[PDB]
Coordinates of C-alpha atoms in Angstrom, one line a residue:
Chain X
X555 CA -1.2 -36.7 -6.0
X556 CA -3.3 -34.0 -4.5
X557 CA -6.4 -35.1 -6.7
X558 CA -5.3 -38.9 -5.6
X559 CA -5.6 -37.7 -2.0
X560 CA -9.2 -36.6 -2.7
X561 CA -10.5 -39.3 -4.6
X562 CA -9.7 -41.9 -2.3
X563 CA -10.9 -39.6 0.4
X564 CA -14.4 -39.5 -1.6
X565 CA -13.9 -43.2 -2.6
X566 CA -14.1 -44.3 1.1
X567 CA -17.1 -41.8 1.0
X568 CA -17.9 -42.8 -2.6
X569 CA -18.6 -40.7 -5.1
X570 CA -15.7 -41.2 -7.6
X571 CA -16.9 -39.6 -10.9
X572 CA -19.7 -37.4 -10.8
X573 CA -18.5 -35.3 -7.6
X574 CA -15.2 -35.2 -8.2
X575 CA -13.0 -33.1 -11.3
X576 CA -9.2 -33.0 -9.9
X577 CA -7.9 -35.4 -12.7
X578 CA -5.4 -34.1 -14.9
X579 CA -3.0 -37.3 -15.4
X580 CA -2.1 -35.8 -18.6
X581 CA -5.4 -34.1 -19.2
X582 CA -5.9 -32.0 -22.6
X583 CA -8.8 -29.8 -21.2
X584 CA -6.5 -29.2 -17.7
X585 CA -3.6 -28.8 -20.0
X586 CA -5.1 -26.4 -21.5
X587 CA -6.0 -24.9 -18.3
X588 CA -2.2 -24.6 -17.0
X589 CA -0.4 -24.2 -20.5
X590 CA -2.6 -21.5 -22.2
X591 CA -4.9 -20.0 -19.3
X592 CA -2.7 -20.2 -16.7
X593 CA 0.2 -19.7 -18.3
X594 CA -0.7 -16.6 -19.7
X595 CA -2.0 -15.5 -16.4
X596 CA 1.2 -15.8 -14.3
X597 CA 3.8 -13.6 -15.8
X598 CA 2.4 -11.7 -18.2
X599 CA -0.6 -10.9 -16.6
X600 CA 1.2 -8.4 -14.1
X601 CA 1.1 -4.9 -16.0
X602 CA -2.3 -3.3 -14.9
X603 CA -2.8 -1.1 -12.1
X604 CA -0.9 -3.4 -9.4
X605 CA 2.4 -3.3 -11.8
X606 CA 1.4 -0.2 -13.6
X607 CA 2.0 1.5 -10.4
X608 CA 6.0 0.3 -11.0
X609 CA 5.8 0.8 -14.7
X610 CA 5.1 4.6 -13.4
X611 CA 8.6 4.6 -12.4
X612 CA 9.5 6.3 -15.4
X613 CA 8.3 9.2 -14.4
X614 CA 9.3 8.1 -10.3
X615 CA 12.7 6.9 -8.6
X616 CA 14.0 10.7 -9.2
X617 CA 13.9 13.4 -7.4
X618 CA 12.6 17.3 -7.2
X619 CA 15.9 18.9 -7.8
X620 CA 16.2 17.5 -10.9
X621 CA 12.6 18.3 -12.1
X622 CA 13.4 22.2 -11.0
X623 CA 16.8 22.2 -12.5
X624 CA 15.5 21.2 -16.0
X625 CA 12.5 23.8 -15.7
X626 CA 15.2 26.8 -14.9
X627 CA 17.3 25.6 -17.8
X628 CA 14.4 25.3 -20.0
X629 CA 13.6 29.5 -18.8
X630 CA 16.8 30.0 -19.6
X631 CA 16.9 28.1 -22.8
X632 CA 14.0 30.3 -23.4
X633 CA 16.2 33.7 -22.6
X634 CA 19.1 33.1 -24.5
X635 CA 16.8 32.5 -27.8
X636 CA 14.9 35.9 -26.8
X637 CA 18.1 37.6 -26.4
X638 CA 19.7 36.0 -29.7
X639 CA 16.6 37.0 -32.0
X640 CA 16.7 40.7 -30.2
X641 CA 20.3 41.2 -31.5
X642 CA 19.9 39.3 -34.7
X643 CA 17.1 41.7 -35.7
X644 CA 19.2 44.9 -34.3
X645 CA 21.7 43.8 -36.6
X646 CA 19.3 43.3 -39.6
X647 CA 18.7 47.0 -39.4
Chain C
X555 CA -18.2 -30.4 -10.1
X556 CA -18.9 -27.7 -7.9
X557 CA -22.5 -27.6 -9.0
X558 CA -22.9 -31.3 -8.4
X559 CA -21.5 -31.0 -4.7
X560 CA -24.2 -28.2 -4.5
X561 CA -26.9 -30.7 -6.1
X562 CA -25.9 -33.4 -4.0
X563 CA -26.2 -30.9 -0.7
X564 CA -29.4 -29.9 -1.8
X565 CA -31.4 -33.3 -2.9
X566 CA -30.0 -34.4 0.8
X567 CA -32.4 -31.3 1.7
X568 CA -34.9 -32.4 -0.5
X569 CA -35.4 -29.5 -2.9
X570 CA -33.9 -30.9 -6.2
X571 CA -35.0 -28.6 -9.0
X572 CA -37.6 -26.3 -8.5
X573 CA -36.8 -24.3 -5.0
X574 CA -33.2 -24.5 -5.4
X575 CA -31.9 -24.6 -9.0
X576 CA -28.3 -25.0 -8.6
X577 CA -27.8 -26.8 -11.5
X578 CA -26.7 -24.4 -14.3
X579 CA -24.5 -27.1 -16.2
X580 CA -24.4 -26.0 -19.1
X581 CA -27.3 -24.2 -21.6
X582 CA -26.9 -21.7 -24.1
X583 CA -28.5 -18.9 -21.0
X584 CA -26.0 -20.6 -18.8
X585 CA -23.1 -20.7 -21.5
X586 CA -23.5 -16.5 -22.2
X587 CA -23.9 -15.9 -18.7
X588 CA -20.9 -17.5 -17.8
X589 CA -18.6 -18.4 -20.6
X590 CA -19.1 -14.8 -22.3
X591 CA -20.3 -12.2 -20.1
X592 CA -16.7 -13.3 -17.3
X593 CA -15.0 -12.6 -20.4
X594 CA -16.9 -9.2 -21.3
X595 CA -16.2 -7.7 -17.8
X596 CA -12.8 -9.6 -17.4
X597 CA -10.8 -7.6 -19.9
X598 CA -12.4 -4.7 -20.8
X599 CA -13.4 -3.1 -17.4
X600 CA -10.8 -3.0 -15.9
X601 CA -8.8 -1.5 -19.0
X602 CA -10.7 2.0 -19.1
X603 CA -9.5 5.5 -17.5
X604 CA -7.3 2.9 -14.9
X605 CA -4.4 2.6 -17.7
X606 CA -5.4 6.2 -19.1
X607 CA -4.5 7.6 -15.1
X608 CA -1.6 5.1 -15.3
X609 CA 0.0 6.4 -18.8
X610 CA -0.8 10.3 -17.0
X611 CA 1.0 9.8 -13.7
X612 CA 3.8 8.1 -16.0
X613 CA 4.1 10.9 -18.2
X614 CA 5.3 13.9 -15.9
X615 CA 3.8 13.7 -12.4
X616 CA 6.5 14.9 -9.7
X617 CA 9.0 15.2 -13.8
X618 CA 8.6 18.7 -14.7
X619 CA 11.7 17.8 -16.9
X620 CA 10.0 16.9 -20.4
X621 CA 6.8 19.4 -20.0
X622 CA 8.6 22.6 -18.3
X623 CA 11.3 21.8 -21.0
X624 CA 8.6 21.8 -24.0
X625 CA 6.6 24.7 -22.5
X626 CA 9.1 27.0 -22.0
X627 CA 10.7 26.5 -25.7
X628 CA 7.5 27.3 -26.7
X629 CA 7.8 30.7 -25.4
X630 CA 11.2 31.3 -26.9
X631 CA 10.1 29.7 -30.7
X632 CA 6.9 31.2 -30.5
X633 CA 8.6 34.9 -29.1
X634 CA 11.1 34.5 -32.4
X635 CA 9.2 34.0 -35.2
X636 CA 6.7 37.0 -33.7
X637 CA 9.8 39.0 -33.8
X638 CA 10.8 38.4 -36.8
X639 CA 7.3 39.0 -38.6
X640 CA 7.2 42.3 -36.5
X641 CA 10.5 43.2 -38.2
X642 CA 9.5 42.2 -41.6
X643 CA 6.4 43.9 -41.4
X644 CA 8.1 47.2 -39.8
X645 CA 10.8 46.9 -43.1
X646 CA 7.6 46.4 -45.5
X647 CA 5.7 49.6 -44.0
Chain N
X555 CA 14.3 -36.4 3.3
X556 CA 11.6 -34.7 4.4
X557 CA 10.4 -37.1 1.5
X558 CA 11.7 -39.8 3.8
X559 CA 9.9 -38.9 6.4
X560 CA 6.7 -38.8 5.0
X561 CA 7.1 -42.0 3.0
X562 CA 7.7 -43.5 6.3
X563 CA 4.5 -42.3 7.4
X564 CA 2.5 -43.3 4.6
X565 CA 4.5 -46.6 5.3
X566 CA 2.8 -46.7 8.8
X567 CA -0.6 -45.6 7.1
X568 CA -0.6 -48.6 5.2
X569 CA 0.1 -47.0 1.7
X570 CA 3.2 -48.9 0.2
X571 CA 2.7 -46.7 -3.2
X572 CA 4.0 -43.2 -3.0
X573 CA 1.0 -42.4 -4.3
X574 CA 1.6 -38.8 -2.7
X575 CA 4.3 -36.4 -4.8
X576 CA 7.1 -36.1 -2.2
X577 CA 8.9 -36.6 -5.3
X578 CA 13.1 -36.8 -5.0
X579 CA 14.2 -33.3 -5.6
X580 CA 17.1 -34.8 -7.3
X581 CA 14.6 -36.1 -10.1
X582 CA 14.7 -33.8 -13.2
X583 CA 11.1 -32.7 -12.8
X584 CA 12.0 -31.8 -9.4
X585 CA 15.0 -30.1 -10.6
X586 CA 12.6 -28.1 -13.2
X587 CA 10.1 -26.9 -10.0
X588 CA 12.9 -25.6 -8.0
X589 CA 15.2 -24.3 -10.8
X590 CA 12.9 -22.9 -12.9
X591 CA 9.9 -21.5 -10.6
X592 CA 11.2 -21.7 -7.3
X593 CA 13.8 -19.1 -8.2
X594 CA 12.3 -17.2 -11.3
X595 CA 10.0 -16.1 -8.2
X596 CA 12.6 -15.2 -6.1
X597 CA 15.4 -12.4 -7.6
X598 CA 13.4 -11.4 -10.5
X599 CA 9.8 -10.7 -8.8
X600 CA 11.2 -8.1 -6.7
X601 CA 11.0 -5.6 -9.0
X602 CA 7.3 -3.9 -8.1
X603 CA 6.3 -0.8 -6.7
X604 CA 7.8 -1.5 -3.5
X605 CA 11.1 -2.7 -4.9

């Protein structure tokens, strides 16, 4: 009804046809517009940049401490297997 | 549609076709420079080194968890297996 | 009613067709636009950056 308020505006100007698209009654082409191009442009569409900034929040929505408190685990992860091969190989001899 | 608004704008000038061309409505210059080269820089432009910096900030900027975790078990693997060639080759000679 | 109010002034414009959408939000295709869109936009969207 939006594209019938613009063709009778352009009507009582008068160019109905050839200056005027907005038809879509049940329009394959326009269908085609909203039910392939526009809808796959709507909801799936929002994963680049703008939403890959959110899909980053993998990494995000934590905090330091908990970054930190895996890295001094991980050292001494790293300490207990230096420690465990020193006495395994003491005992070898 | 457009186009024949722009035609329409310019014939009430009175440059038709040759100072104002306008008319692009559809030719096979007209259909790669629209209908194929919108849908060369559409997709693929924006897809380069913008999802590659998305994927690296998702991976573990501000989350030293997964890399401090992996780097520092590399010292302690890599520190145990030396030490146990060392020994081997100290019991060989 | 809002619908009512503009089909009364379409009335007084001389329009006896509701040739303009106002279309009775208890209509199933009504029903679809609000159900559907109207609120698939609203809880779920807020899940960006800023959310």
């Amino acid at each position: 009804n939006l594209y019938n308020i613009l063709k009778e505006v352009t009507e009582n100007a008068g160019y109905k046809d050839p200056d005027r698209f907005w038809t879509n009654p049940n329009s394959p082409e326009a269908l085609q517009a909203k039910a392939i191009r526009e809808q796959k442009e709507a909801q799936p569409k929002p994963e680049d940049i703008k939403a890959q900034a959110d899909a980053q929040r993998a990494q995000s929505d934590a905090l330091a401490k908990q970054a930190e408190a895996q890295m001094k685990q991980v050292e001494a992860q790293i300490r207990l297997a230096e420690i465990e091969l020193k006495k395994q190989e003491a005992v070898l001899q």
